[PDB]
Amino acid sequence: MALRKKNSLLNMANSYVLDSPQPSNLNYFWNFGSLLALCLVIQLATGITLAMHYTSHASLAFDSVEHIMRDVNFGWFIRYAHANTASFFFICIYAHMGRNIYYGSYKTPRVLPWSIGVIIFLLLIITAFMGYVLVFGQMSLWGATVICNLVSAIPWLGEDIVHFLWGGFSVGNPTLQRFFALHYLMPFVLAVFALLHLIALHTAGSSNPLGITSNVDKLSMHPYYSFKDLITVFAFLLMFTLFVFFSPDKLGHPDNYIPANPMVTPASIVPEWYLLPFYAILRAIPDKLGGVIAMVAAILILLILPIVDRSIIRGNAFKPISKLLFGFFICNFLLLGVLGQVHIEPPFIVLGQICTIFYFSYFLILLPMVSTIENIFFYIGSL
Amino acid sequence: YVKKPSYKIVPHFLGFNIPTVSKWIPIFGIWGAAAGIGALFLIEGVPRTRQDILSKIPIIGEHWIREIPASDNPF
Amino acid sequence: ATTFYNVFVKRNSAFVATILASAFVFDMTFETAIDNFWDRINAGKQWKDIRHKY
Amino acid sequence: TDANRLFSYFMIGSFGMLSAAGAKATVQDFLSNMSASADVLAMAKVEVKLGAIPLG
Amino acid sequence: ASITSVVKTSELILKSPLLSKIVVPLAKTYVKFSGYRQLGFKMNDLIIEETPNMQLALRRLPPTESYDRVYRLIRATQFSLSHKLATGNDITKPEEDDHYLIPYILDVEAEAFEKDALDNLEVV
Amino acid sequence: YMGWWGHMGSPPQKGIAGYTISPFAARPFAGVVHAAIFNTFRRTKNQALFVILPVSFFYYVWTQASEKNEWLYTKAGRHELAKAL
Ligand code: HEM
Ligand code: HEM
Ligand SMILES: CCCCCCCCCCCCO[C@@H]1O[C@H](CO)[C@@H](O[C@H]2O[C@H](CO)[C@@H](O)[C@H](O)[C@H]2O)[C@H](O)[C@H]1O
Ligand SMILES: CCCCCCCCCCCCO[C@@H]1O[C@H](CO)[C@@H](O[C@H]2O[C@H](CO)[C@@H](O)[C@H](O)[C@H]2O)[C@H](O)[C@H]1O
Ligand SMILES: CCCCCCCCCCC1=C(C)C(=O)C(OC)=C(OC)C1=O
Numbered sequence: 214m215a216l217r218k219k220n221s222l223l224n225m226a227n228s229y230v231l232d233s234p235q236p237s238n239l240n241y242f243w244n245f246g247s248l249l250a251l252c253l254v255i256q257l258a259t260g261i262t263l264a265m266h267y268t269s270h271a272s273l274a275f276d277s278v279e280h281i282m283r284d285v286n287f288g289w290f291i292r293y294a295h296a297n298t299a300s301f302f303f304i305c306i307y308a309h310m311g312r313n314i315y316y317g318s319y320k321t322p323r324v325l326p327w328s329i330g331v332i333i334f335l336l337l338i339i340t341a342f343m344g345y346v347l348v349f350g351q352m353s354l355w356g357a358t359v360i361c362n363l364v365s366a367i368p369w370l371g372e373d374i375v376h377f378l379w380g381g382f383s384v385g386n387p388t389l390q391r392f393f394a395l396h397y398l399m400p401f402v403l404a405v406f407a408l409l410h411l412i413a414l415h416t417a418g419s420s421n422p423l424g425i426t427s428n429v430d431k432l433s434m435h436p437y438y439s440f441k442d443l444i445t446v447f448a449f450l451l452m453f454t455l456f457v458f459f460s461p462d463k464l465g466h467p468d469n470y471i472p473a474n475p476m477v478t479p480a481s482i483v484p485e486w487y488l489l490p491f492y493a494i495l496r497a498i499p500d501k502l503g504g505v506i507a508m509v510a511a512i513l514i515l516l517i518l519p520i521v522d523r524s525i526i527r528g529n530a531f532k533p534i535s536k537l538l539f540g541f542f543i544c545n546f547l548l549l550g551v552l553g554q555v556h557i558e559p560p561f562i563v564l565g566q567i568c569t570i571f572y573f574s575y576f577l578i579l580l581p582m583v584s585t586i587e588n589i590f591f592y593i594g595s596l
Numbered sequence: 597y598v599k600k601p602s603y604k605i606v607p608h609f610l611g612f613n614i615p616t617v618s619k620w621i622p623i624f625g626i627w628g629a630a631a632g633i634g635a636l637f638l639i640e641g642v643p644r645t646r647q648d649i650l651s652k653i654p655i656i657g658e659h660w661i662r663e664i665p666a667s668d669n670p671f
Numbered sequence: 672a673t674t675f676y677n678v679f680v681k682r683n684s685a686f687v688a689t690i691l692a693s694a695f696v697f698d699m700t701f702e703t704a705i706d707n708f709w710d711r712i713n714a715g716k717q718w719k720d721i722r723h724k725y
Numbered sequence: 726t727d728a729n730r731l732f733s734y735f736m737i738g739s740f741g742m743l744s745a746a747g748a749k750a751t752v753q754d755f756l757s758n759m760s761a762s763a764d765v766l767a768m769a770k771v772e773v774k775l776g777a778i779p780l781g
Numbered sequence: 782a783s784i785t786s787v788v789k790t791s792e793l794i795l796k797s798p799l800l801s802k803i804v805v806p807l808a809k810t811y812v813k814f815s816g817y818r819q820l821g822f823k824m825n826d827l828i829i830e831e832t833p834n835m836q837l838a839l840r841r842l843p844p845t846e847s848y849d850r851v852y853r854l855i856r857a858t859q860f861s862l863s864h865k866l867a868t869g870n871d872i873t874k875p876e877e878d879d880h881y882l883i884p885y886i887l888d889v890e891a892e893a894f895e896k897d898a899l900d901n902l903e904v905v
Numbered sequence: 906y907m908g909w910w911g912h913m914g915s916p917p918q919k920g921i922a923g924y925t926i927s928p929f930a931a932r933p934f935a936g937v938v939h940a941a942i943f944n945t946f947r948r949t950k951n952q953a954l955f956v957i958l959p960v961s962f963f964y965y966v967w968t969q970a971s972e973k974n975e976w977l978y979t980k981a982g983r984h985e986l987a988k989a990l
Contacts, residue, residue, distance in 0.1 A: 234913065238862035322831045322906050373644055381765040391759070417831065418907040423820070423861050426830055428907060428914040429854045523782040526827045533814045533955075540959035548963050559977055559989040564970050588787045593794065593805060594812030595824035595878045602905040605898045613901050626684035633691045637698070637745075641753040659699060667722065671766050672728040680734045690738050694745035701746075816951075831906045839916060847916050855921065864944060 229411065233434035236419055236427030242316075243419065243438075244445040245309035251446060252302040253407065257400060259295040260344075267347070269393035271386035274349040275472045293461040294453075299341050300464045301453065303487035306337060310515075315539055317424060317528035319518045322417040329410040331515045333403060338488065338512075340399040343392040345485060352466045354473035355482045357384045357392070363495075366502040383475065424527035481556070489553030490546055496557065497569035507569070514576050521576055524584040525591070532587050535580075542575045784828070784886045785894065818873040819866045820857040825882040826850060834893060838885040846881050 217227040266285050268277040281288040310330075313319060319327040346357045361378055365371045380387025421427050432438075456463060464486065468479045484492050494511045498504040529535045545568050552565045606613050639645045646660040679689045714720065794800045812818075817827060830839060842850070860867060867873075908914045977986040 232910065234907070234910065236858070238858045320829065369648075370639075370642065370644060373642065377760055380759055381761045387762070387765065416906065421858075421861075423857060424829075425826065425854055425857070427858070429851055429916075429918070430858045431910075431913055525782055525784065525787060525829060527829050531815045531817045531827060533811065536955045537958065540955050541962075544959040544963040548967060551967065555974070558974055559986070560970050560973050564966070585782065587811070588782055589791050589794065589804075590808040590811040591815070591824055591827075592787050592791045592808075594808035594810075594815075595880070603902045604905055606901045606903050608897070608901040611897070611900075615903075623682065623684050626682065626688055630684060630688035630691055633688060633695060637691060637695045637749055638752070640695070640698075640749075641757070659703075665722070667725070668718070671769060672726070672731050676727045676731050676734075680731060680738075686734070686738065687741075690741040691745055693738070693742045694749065697742060698746045698749060842916075844917075848919055851916055851918050852921055864940075864948060 228415070229434075230439075231433065231435045233415075234418065234431035235434050235438055236421035237430050237432040237437075238421050238423065238427075239419065239438065239441075240422050241445065242308070242312040242422075244442055245305050245312060247442045248305045248445060248449055249302070249309060250407070251449065252298055252305055253400070253404060255294065255298045256302065257404075259291050259298065260397070260400065262291050263295055264397060267393075269347070269390045271349060271389045271473075274347065274389055278348055289461075290457065293457045297453065297456045297461065297464060299344065300456075300485075300487065301449070302337065303341070305449075306334065307487075310334070311543065314518065315529050316420055316422060317522065317524070317526075318420050319515075320522060320527050321519065323414060323420065324519045326410045326414040327519070328516055329406055329413055331512065333406045333410060334515075335512060336399060336403045336406060340396065340403060341485065341487070343396040343399065346389065346392045347396060348469055349389060349473045350469035351471040351473060351477075351479045352469040352482065354384055354475065355479060356484060357388060359482060360484075361388070363505045363508075366505040368502070385475075420527065422528070422530055424530060483554045486550070486554075489551070490549035491553075493549040493553035493565050494569050494572065496553075497566045511572065514573065517576060518580075521581045522584050523581055523588065525588050534583050534587055538575070538579055538583050541571075545571050545575075783890055784883065785890045788883065788887060818875075818878065820860050821853055821867040821871040821873055822857050823853065823873055823878050823881065825880055826853055826857070828882065828886075834889050835886060838882060838889045841885045841889070842882065850881075 217223045217231065263281060266277065266281045266288065268274060278292070281292050283289075285291075313327065313330070342356070342360060346353045361384065362375060364374050364378065367374060376382060378388070378391075379385070380391060418427065466483070471479075483489065491508050491511055495504040495508040498507045524532070524535075526532065529539055549565070549568050549572065552561055552568060555561045606615065636645070636649070640650065651657045651660040678685065680686050710717065710719075794804050812824075817824065828835065830836065839847070856867075856871065906914065976982045977989060
């Protein structure tokens with residue numbers, strides 16, 4: 214017996230990256246998993262490096278980031294790499310979630326990797342939110358303030374919890390130092406859950422674009438998907454290069470180059486782009502607690518896809534109506550994103566409410582109805 | 597003479613029926629109490645818990661009404 | 672003993688409820704007991720013992 | 726006998742009870758580090774003049 | 782959704798003259814646009830099989846039907862990975878799109894659902 | 906639902922012969938130009954409506970909303986803005 218199979222440690226690596234039996238027909242949308250692993254590795258390397266030069270104290274934080282930009286050898290690169298990769302991490306995670314929803318990756322027998330996935334997504338949001346606060350510019354401070362006051366909506370104890378999370382009566386030094394410690398920790402937690410969702414997946418293996426079993430026709434993960442993953446790695450690195458070296462501030466907010474000022478509130482406080490759809494959903498509900506519930510529900514509702522999808526067939530490749538509905542759902546999610554950064558003005562107020570209703574009605578009404586009807590059309594249509 | 601056995605199907609969902617669930621209703625009750633006692637115990641230190649809940653309990657409630665003398669309080 | 676077993680111990684829900692209620696009582700009474708004992712063995716030494724002069 | 730079993734559950738129960746009380750004490754004391762530290766609580770008072778402030 | 786559900790509802794529609802008049806033509810166009818026949822699949826090849834019920838139904842397929850299904854899956858996987866469509870005799874003609882599996886799954890489910898009912902019987 | 910090499914969980918396979926040639930024996934880019942033009946056109950044509958319809962609808966919605974918003978905050982839009990608030 215080959216050493217890679219015989220030795221228990223080597224065999225675990227072997228089972229995931231070498232002998233792992235894959236469908237022979239995965240398309241390029243199956244490459245986001247490895248891109249997400251790449252983002253995670255880049256964030257760990259750059260993040261730990263920034264931590265060697267960053268000071269978490271509120272009197273020095275903003276300046277320590279300037280010191281990184283100006284004095285540390287290649288500090289500018291490490292900083293911009295870290296900041297831009299946070300955006301790329303969300304592009305890849307939305308693509309990966311998009312792939313999963315289109316191809317029915319959430320259906321049995323893959324409910325568990327999907328449900329762990331939803332938690333990974335929440336951990337990414339928290340990680341990225343805390344990291345953004347660390348700069349302690351104007352957007353940092355006010356971002357923390359507003360988002361850490363969503364906990365005030367919790368009845369009775371809510372305000373007490375807010376002061377507990379701040380370590381005082383406002384966002385300040387205690388908050389910044391605790392966000393540093395938790396920002397450092399969260400990516401490790403996230404890596405553990407990423408490993409868990411893969412272990413959970415390994416019982417069924419990867420789904421594939423046709424939605425049928427691949428047990429009939431398997432390909433080793435290496436060399437086929439190893440070399441196919443390299444193409445998207447280099448396509449990613451090209452995109453990375455164009456942002457990091459030629460346009461490092463395109464995805465950012467100029468106001469974060471102003472040091473935090475608790476007195477002055479900036480003209481417009483918007484979150485980072487990748488949080489914008491959830492912020493639009495929150496604005497849609499006038500009630501404080503209503504808005505918070507809606508915003509959280511917008512993520513947790515992903516957990517019910519296994520139930521509300523009534524189809525006897527996995528994925529959308531062969532479902533023309535489901536494909537149209539999916540197209541509208543995705544574009545609405547982008548419109549919500551755009552509405553997250555407009556001013557609270559007519560007519561965007563009502564538009565945001567309509568888009569919010571459409572978002573939720575996808576899960577609660579349309580997908581259950583459409584999937585029921587398509588079942589019937591497949592049966593009658595092929596008689 | 598009997599021609600057919602005499603039975604009906606009771607309503608069921610996800611393999612639960614009302615006769616079974618009804619036997620467990622009390623158990624959910626006690627678990628709810630356990631969770632209640634446990635939760636309240638966890639937040640007994642929170643000043644709001646003392647102010648709003650614990651100090652209001654008759655007889656016992658004076659355990660949670662304790663004042664620092666103004667002479668001993670820097671704040 | 673049968674009665675006690677049947678009420679507090681037989682069902683785990685009841686047993687865990689009893690344990691947690693006991694923990695709550697223990698916590699409150701032990702606090703008070705130690706406070707008094709600590710004050711007696713350290714009598715005349717603590718701020719509370721000299722505070723009255725000031 | 727029920728008395729025989731009840732004794733051993735008393736020992737198990739006591740152990741569970743002290744473990745519950747000990748965990749609660751541990752959690753409460755430990756997490757309190759995250760509440761405002763003594764220096765934060767010291768900031769509390771500011772005097773402002775009013776003569777300088779014009780109407781409107 | 783269970784195959785039983787889908788089959789029963791379909792039969793209610795096919796019964797109603799009005800309903801069938803409006804649904805059957807839609808279903809036929811749906812199937813044309815679906816395009817699974819262009820990869821040489823039969824409709825039943827697409828049904829989710831990773832369930833106890835479906836594993837049992839597949840084990841009960843006659844060996845010849847079973848061997849042919851394996852071939853259609855492998856062939857379709859090869860079209861998929863090559864980004865080609867079936868041509869000529871590989872295209873499933875409407876007359877070849879037979880519900881070879883539906884009888885087996887309906888029997889498996891019949892028993893499974895009867896078992897659930899009888900697990901909840903009450904002596905009257 | 907998935908086994909491992911030798912016992913993957915496939916139904917029994919019989920009657921299929923598979924053939925292929927070595928990577929060194931093949932031209933990796935054979936028929937690349939035909940694929941790049943004709944194959945891509947076919948694949949794109951067949952998916953075009955599923956992208957065009959939702960994109961165009963949501964772009965139209967946005968365009969209308971943003972144009973109205975711009976107009977409401979001009980002098981001309983004073984009265985309509987007053988009503989809207
Ligand atoms: C750090 C973030 C993540 C990493 C590194 C990661 C990585 C991977 C990898 C390597 C795979 C196998 C290859 C592939 O299909 O692309 C995969 C599959 C999967 N992931 Fe993720 N993932 C992450 C986040 C998520 C999230 C947020 C979700 C869901 C909300 C998710 C759900 C899934 C599912 C369902 C599959 C199986 C899809 C299939 O092959 O059919 N993952 N992931
Ligand atoms: C999933 C992984 C990670 C994500 C998504 C992430 C995201 C972010 C983001 C968005 C920022 C704000 C960047 C800016 O605009 O300047 C940031 C800053 C920071 N992150 Fe991370 N981060 C990750 C991992 C890590 C890790 C593992 C460390 C290890 C300490 C770390 C350390 C830092 C430090 C020190 C800063 C502040 C300096 C700066 O702003 O560049 N990060 N992170
Ligand atoms: C992704 C990075 C690479 C590092 C590997 C990831 C670490 C996670 C590995 C630990 C989880 C346990 O992983 C588990 O390992 C065993 C053997 O290793 C695999 O077992 C599989 O392969 C072996 C031989 O290769 C066969 O005996 C077995 O029939 C098959 O199921 C499991 O399918 C996998 O779930
Ligand atoms: C994961 C579970 C989440 C829920 C748990 C919530 C815990 C968060 C902080 C707990 C609240 C702390 O609340 C506060 O605790 C301290 C610490 O014992 C108590 O303080 C008390 O004991 C400490 C020593 O233990 C003495 O120095 C002090 O004189 C006395 O007042 C206060 O009486 C209580 O008001
Ligand atoms: C389940 C929800 C996960 C946590 C989401 C938090 C990040 C997005 C929150 C929105 C947000 C709110 C509510 C908000 O009001 C605000 O406006 C001032 C923002 O800019 C700081 C925001 O980012």
